[PDB]
């Protein structure tokens, strides 16, 4: 009504805003090299005028999906990003060089020089998020007959990042929020994913990734430890409750449209992810005044973790959108399957939205199913309205929105906010991402081993891009 139309306008504003934040033509980020994704044009309070491997990887993956669906104009953007990464990989920084840990460096200056001050480094998700983004583009190239571009440019780039993942997964580092030195759900989840699709990608170009194959099952094994019995623990080595939107992100960024409600990979419709969803969201109901008076069956403003004190601890646009996106994803999964199941694990999730919820299997033609799917859609859309209510009048999406009055705060025009909007909207519309092979990578080994595999490192030089026509 308002929502459908706002979303439609907002998607268009988000696509533009992201482009304004990518060099060397990006209107808001003059100074940024070619294919460099800037986190935000805010150069002071806070200073976000840097390129993070995570934000960039997440943003480009989004644009690659848009591109595969017909937004052909994004081609040059993706090519420039690929070329920029050929360079960054080789940049010597506080985390090391290409073959000695450099790949793990969190952020860089927009000019492609290293950031040398103190930072929570390394962040092991980066390499995995970059590989995922590149593999998508690489797949398109193979499908459209640009085999050479896939085999000689993309593959070797990906091969570097996959090698980092297989080698250091089993080592502590910082979480996506760059504050906890330990082992993080999000990181492990995206790492498992990357190796699985990394392996399929290697086979497609006529090469192999033995280190992908030997480590993915072990990463999966370890992931299981994050299930506490009632929710997903955001991090090992933390003194907090462990309720964190990090776990929602892990699920949506590892969603496979071909997967069932698999618990071992924490899919969106899995009992564990649904139980988790309620625990996380509920953790923000009583700490934000903006949430005052809402009931348990209503959407609330979501932040990162309940203990957060960054800018005083406020809801984040991307965290609120992730809460919605997981539901969109589960809805799609249930529809595709033709049923939904309520277990003891997911009962509270369902019961809060539909008081008549009881364990059992509900076929898609059943009354219970209709009742539940409507409640779920309504709830999901409700998080989106919170976003809509606090977005700026011209559509500007900030990092945070005040916990008391909803005014935008922290970094303005955060690229990540814009990407999160794009994906929540796609999912809402049933536009899902290419599958990553989850259906052959959900079997958990009987015994988990604390291990690694060492792959191979080689500097890539992008001398020329074929003249691709989309
Ligand atoms: C919807 O409408 C919105 C409202 O109009 C619109 O947002 C506005 O967009 C303009 C850009 O078109 C923004 O202008 C910038 O303002 C900067 C100063 O901001 C402070 O002061 C403002 C006024 O008092 C505040 O409004 C502003 O608050 C906002 O930002 C806060 C911080 O993130 C946030 O918390 C608030 O909630 C609020 O959102 C903030 O307090 C100003 O610095 C900046 O100037 C730079 O860029 C100009 C060109 O784009 C240059 O001409 C200028 O010389 C400056 O360039 C420097 O910085 C650039 C990066 O931004 C670099 O590209 C340049 O190379 C250069 O950098 C050098 O200097 C740096 C030193 O710190 C250094 O680090 C660099 O390495 C380099 O050496 C610009 O004028 C305006 O802030 C926005 N207003 C608001 C309220 O957000 C929005 O974009 C519209 N959205 C859509 C979707 O259309
Ligand atoms: C490298 O790989 C190996 C192999 O996979 C990893 O080893 C596994 O590590 C996990 C995590 O430590 C470990 O699981 C723990 O088992 C203990 C007993 O067997 C449990 O007591 C412990 O409980 C915590 O987590 C539960 C969820 O699993 C929570 O329900 C519970 O509340 C506990 O959580 C609190 O306490 C922890 C302290 O550990 C704290 O950090 C939390 O934040 C929270 O406050 C775990 O379940 C496996 O048994 C190990 N497996 C093997 C085969 O040895 C290793 O961790 C990897 N290393 C890195 C750095 O990646
Ligand atoms: C995930 O993958 C495993 C095999 O790796 C399947 O057994 C499971 O059903 C799901 O498809
Ligand atoms: C399912 O498959 C995995 C490998 O993907 C095995 O490790 C597991 O033991 C089960 O056979
Ligand atoms: C970690 O352990 C595995 C299996 O136990 C080895 O194959 C690997 O090489 C590393 O030593
Ligand atoms: C990853 O780390 C393991 C340690 O378990 C080594 O055996 C391997 O060679 C690589 O360094
Ligand atoms: C892991 O170890 C192998 C073998 O020593 C190297 O070739 C690789 O670069 C990484 O250091
Ligand atoms: C690891 O393997 C790659 C691919 O064969 C080599 O090019 C690299 O130099 C290292 O030996
Ligand atoms: C390792 O592999 C890269 C990518 O093919 C080469 O550019 C490099 O010379 C080395 O052989
Ligand atoms: C690979 O790494 C070398 C440095 O070893 C760079 O010079 C090259 O541009 C690429 O990044
Ligand atoms: C790409 O190739 C050039 C040589 O053509 C190297 O110097 C660079 O380090 C990377 O291997
Ligand atoms: C230019 O040079 C690079 C590396 O030196 C090649 O891999 C590329 O395909 C082109 O020939
Ligand atoms: O957007 C830049 C940077 N800001 C702070 C966030 O915690 C982190 O995830 C992000 O990469
Ligand atoms: O104030 C700590 C702050 N530092 C830097 C990180 O970007 C952010 O996630 C964290 O909350």
Residue nearest to atom 1 of ligand 5 (CA): 451
Indicate the resolution in Å. Answer: 2.3
301 closest CA partner among 221, 211, 207, 403: 403
Question: What are the beta bridge partners of residue 340?
Answer: 362
Output the CA 458–ligand 11 centroid distance in Å: 9
Atom number of ligand 1 nearest to Cα 397: 93
Return d(Cα 228, Cα 450) in angstroms, integer: 20
Residue 41: CB atoms within 10 A of its CB come to 22
Cα 210 to Cα 150, 190, 394, 454: the distances in Å are 19, 19, 49, 10
State in Å: Cα 458 to ligand 9 middle: 5
| Joined tokens for residue 317 | 């646009």
| Residue listed under structure tokens 């529809």 | 335
Structural tokens at position 405: 């009055």
CA distances, 199 to each of 124, 148, 350, 363 (Å): 19, 18, 37, 36
| Radius of gyration, alpha carbons of the chain | 21
Q: Among all ligands shown, which has an atom nearest to the Cα of 466?
A: 12
Query: What is the longest distance spanned by two Cα atoms in the chain?
Result: 63
- Which domains can be identified in the chain, with CATH numbers? 1-470 (1.50.10.10)
91 alpha carbon, closest ligand: 10
- Rounded CA-CA distance 15/145 in Å is 27
CB 21 within 8 A of CB 28: yes
Q: How many CB atoms lie within 10 A of CB 454?
A: 9
Helix count (H) and strand count (E) of the chain? Answer: 14, 9
DSSP 152: I
Annotation: binding site: 119
Cα 187 to chain centroid distance, Å, stands at: 10
7-22 burial, b at 16+ Cβ within 10 Å, e below that, comes to beebbebbbebbbbbb
Q: Is 444 in the pocket of ligand 2 (CB under 6 A)?
A: no
Nearest atom in ligand 4 to 221's CA: 7
Residues with CB under 6 A from ligand 8: 456, 458
Helix (H, G, I), strand (E, B) or coil at 30: coil
Annotated binding site for substrate: 119
Indicate which technique resolved this structure. Answer: X-ray
Q: How far is CA 37 from CA 49, 117, 212, in A?
A: 10, 20, 28
- Residues labelled catalytic: 175, 178
Q: Of all atoms in ligand 9, which is nearest to the CA of residue 152?
A: 5
The residue whose CA has the least distance to atom 11 of ligand 2 is: 225
């Amino acid at each position: 009504a308002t929502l459908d139309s706002w979303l439609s306008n907002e998607a268009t504003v988000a696509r533009t805003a992201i482009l304004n934040n990518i060099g060397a033509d990006g209107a808001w980020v003059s100074g940024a090299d070619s294919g460099i994704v800037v986190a935000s044009p805010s150069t002071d309070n806070p200073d976000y005028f840097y390129t993070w491997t995570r934000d960039s990887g997440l943003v480009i993956k989004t644009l690659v999906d848009l591109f595969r669906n017909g937004d052909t104009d994004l081609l040059s953007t993706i090519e420039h990003y690929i070329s920029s990464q050929a360079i960054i990989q080789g940049v010597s920084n506080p985390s090391g060089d290409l073959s000695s840990g450099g790949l793990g460096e969190p952020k860089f200056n927009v000019d492609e020089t290293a950031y040398t001050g103190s930072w929570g480094r390394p962040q092991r998700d980066g390499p995995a998020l970059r590989a995922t983004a590149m593999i998508g583009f690489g797949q398109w190239l193979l499908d459209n007959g640009y085999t050479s571009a896939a085999t000689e440019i993309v593959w070797p780039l990906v091969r570097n990042d996959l090698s980092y993942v297989a080698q250091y997964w089993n080592q502590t580092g910082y979480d996506l929020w760059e504050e906890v030195n330990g082992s993080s759900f999000f990181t492990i989840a995206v790492q498992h994913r990357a190796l699985v699709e990394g392996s399929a990608f290697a086979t497609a170009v006529g090469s192999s990734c033995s280190w992908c194959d030997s480590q993915a099952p072990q990463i999966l094994c370890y992931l299981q430890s994050f299930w506490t019995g009632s929710y997903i623990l955001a991090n090992f080595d933390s003194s907090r409750s462990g309720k964190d939107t990090n776990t929602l992100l892990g699920s949506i960024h590892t969603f496979d449209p071909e997967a069932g409600c698999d618990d071992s990979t924490f899919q969106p419709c899995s009992p564990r992810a649904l139980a988790n969803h309620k625990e996380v969201v509920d953790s923000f109901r009583s700490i934000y005044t903006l949430n005052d008076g809402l009931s348990d069956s209503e959407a609330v403003a979501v932040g990162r973790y309940p203990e957060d004190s960054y800018y005083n601890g406020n809801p984040w646009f991307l965290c609120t959108l992730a809460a919605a996106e997981q539901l969109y994803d589960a809805l799609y999964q249930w529809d595709k399957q033709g049923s939904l199941e309520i277990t003891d694990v997911s009962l509270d999730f369902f019961k809060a939205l539909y008081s008549g919820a009881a364990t059992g299997t509900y076929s898609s033609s059943s009354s219970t199913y209709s009742s539940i799917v409507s409640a779920v859609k309504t709830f999901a859309d409700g998080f989106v309205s919170i976003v809509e209510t606090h977005a700026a009048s011209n559509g500007s999406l900030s990092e945070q929105f005040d916990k008391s009055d909803g005014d935008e705060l922290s970094a303005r025009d955060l690229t990540w906010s814009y990407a999160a909007l794009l994906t929540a909207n796609n999912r809402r519309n049933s536009v899902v991402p290419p599958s990553w092979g989850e259906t052959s990578a959900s079997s958990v080994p009987g015994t988990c081993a604390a291990t690694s595999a060492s792959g191979t490192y080689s500097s890539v030089t992008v001398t020329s891009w074929p003249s691709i026509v989309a």
